[PDB]
């Protein structure tokens, strides 16, 4: 641990060869046209030859199906809606879109006991199967056919569908970082100590996920280099204490302090642009079409749950009033739990960072500390600006923010009341 639990075929660019071919034919990227009469080829066709082999990775989806992607051009397999002879669809190369026509199911068959097993590729819920066009040992194209024949007697037509693994290139996979513990809320050392700024706060690693480059939008690389050298991107999840304010509160006075939490809209759109992911109002992960196929594996690695709301997390502006009950001036600093996501390349370079400040877990520290001074007291709470009513509740005042303790909003009395 950490262990993303990727299958072996999801970590290698395998050369796929036909099991029953006697001259070493397989899936190829040769530029020469098909040699068979009723098997026309073009620039996009998936070729079948014994020279110039393809090396393909299978990105595992949540439902168990795979995305077959090429190591050289970075494109994926696609079942085109075009019809050939005998009502067949050609298999072409195309950029990844997440459509159903790019998902393929692998089914293993044969004699596992003798090591002579093979596998097939099916589409449209086992109604079509990928097959060589007529030829076993000739340059031809790959297609899908609704003519499915029994497997227990490897019929002549079934032999055009049997694939095995051969040579491979290792995919570029970054190492998962080890988790660490979250520190306590930093204590100020003096009256002039303004506290720990976010650029200096110590972060704790809480999760990480491996992202297929097909769903990652990186402008600094091309699709070819992004497939060979960054086959999987690293997405870390970190936590740190994000300072909300730091101020000297005079003796026996009440001050009005603004508290800004949540996440900005431009930061949300940034994460949507690069990853097709964003944060929900419940601080859960929400996904869009390009990346929704892997959302369950990503969340299990990140240790962040799927969001149970359709409301997008936004900016939250709240005005608080605190009262210092001591007869001296005290430095008070308040921190809220920040949830940080970092996308890194295989070599470790950071692509972007996205931070959301969780106002539900916050605490206060002070100098002088206990037992010299008494804890700060929250005496008023007003929500100033927020673009959604997912959490339109305030703390029931008064409320004492003891030094060091984390005030969990869902464990306090709120207005209007909840958990009723």
């Amino acid at each position: 641990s950490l262990n993303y639990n990727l299958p072996e075929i999801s970590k290698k660019f395998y050369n796929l060869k036909n099991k029953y071919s006697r001259n070493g034919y397989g899936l190829s990227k040769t530029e020469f046209p098909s040699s068979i009469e009723n098997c026309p080829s073009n620039e996009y066709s998936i070729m079948y030859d014994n020279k110039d082999p393809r090396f393909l990775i299978r990105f595992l989806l949540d439902d168990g199906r795979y995305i077959i992607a090429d190591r050289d051009d970075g494109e994926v397999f696609d079942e085109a809606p075009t019809y050939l002879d005998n009502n067949n669809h050609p298999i072409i190369s195309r950029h990844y879109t997440g459509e159903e026509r790019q998902k393929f199911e692998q089914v293993g068959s044969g004699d596992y006991i003798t090591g002579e097993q093979f596998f097939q590729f099916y589409t449209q819920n086992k109604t079509r199967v990928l097959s060589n066009c007529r030829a076993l040992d000739s340059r031809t194209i790959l297609l899908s056919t609704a003519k499915i024949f029994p497997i227990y007697p490897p019929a002549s037509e079934t032999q055009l569908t049997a694939f095995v693994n051969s040579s491979f290139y290792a995919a570029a996979i970054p190492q998962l970082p080890q988790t660490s513990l979250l520190e306590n809320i930093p204590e100020p050392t003096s009256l002039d100590d303004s506290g720990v700024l976010p650029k200096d706060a110590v972060r704790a690693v809480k999760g990480s996920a491996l992202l297929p480059c097909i769903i990652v939008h990186d402008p600094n690389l091309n699709n070819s280099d992004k497939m060979k050298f960054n086959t999987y991107y690293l997405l870390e999840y970190k936590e740190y204490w994000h300072q909300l304010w730091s101020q000297i509160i005079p003796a026996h006075q009440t001050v009005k302090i603004q508290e800004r939490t949540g996440i900005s809209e431009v930061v949300q759109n940034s994460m949507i642009e690069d990853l097709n992911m964003y944060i929900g109002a419940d601080f859960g992960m929400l996904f869009y079409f390009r990346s929704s196929g892997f959302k369950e594996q990503i969340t299990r690695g990140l240790n962040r749950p799927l969001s149970q709301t359709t409301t997008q997390l936004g900016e939250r502006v709240e005005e608080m009033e605190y009262y210092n009950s001591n007869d001296l001036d005290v430095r008070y600093v308040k921190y809220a739990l920040a949830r940080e996501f970092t996308l890194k390349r295989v070599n470790g370079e950071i692509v972007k960072n996205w931070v959301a400040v969780d106002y539900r877990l916050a605490g206060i520290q002070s100098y002088p500390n206990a037992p010299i001074t008494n804890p700060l007291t929250l005496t008023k709470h007003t929500i100033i600006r927020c673009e959604n009513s997912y959490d339109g509740h305030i703390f029931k005042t008064p409320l004492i923010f003891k030094n060091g303790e984390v005030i969990v909003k869902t464990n306090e009395e709120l207005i209007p009341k909840i958990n009723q």
């Binding site: 006991i113 097993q117 520190e183 359709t310 739990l337 969990v408 958990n419």
Partner: protein, 364 residues
Amino acid sequence: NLDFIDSFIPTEGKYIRVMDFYNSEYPFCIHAPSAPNGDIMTEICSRENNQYFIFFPTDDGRVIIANRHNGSVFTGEATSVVSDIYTGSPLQFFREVKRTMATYYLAIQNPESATDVRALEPHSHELPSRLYYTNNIENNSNILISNKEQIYLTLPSLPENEQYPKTPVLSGIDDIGPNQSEKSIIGSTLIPCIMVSDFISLGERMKTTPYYYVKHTQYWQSMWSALFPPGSKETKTEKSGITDTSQISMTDGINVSIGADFGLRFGNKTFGIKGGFTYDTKTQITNTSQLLIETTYTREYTNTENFPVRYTGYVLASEFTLHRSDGTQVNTIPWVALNDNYTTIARYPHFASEPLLGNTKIIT
């Protein structure tokens, strides 16, 4: 408790809850029937296990809503929701959609036509009522539910994952080596009590051990040991696969089977948790419809050294055990799978070469 700051706001399957509808005039709580079958009602609130529920999560976020009295689950029927035994039916999977921080509605998806989503709703706020369906979701507060009570669960402790086991070392030419190496812990997963079989009644499971857990270990299993003369070739017997008795016990125990490709196959009850099950135990879902069977191989091993060498063959073993929340092991039949494609040969002296693999046969 800063080490567990992410447990202060827990997921939906970490606590027992008491539910009520938001705009109810009188204190009405959701009530499950005392019989294993019957209609779900909103009765007046009281401290009875018929009004206590646990949301068991699944891979896609949906939940299975079981009551603490008998363990029956929410079952979506024709016009109202009933409480039936859990069988993995699609009518028993619901989705909690949080409209706000404290209000939510429960949605059932018709197995036919996935665009037909209906929310649970009563037909009265002043009298007891069954739970009906409705397609009026937007700006409809009649479907909103509030958790009247939340009691957190004490989940069982899970052991720490250990690194993969290494091959045992021989201390001499007369040392046959241990029968088994150390059983390394690979992973553990929490499985709801309604998906396993046990002599404890479901009603008692929901009270004392609402979550079971499966432990996945790996170790080296000894197959043969001999002192090979120099230049001699011997034939040794090696077993692979899983026995038919173990295959059936695991299938009846946790509704999981081992395919021919050493991947796991899930039945109707555990199909919705196969993602978390495999991820936690570091296993894979099978891609073949064939089951793993017991097979006996014979392999030729030749000592190509000038001197006698002691050899001991080991096969990688994969074991699964079912445990209750108190740690007790449930299955009395071992759930072990041997993979002859992963072998190591302990040798003495240590600097000797590996024996030359000759030909392999299969005994029926």
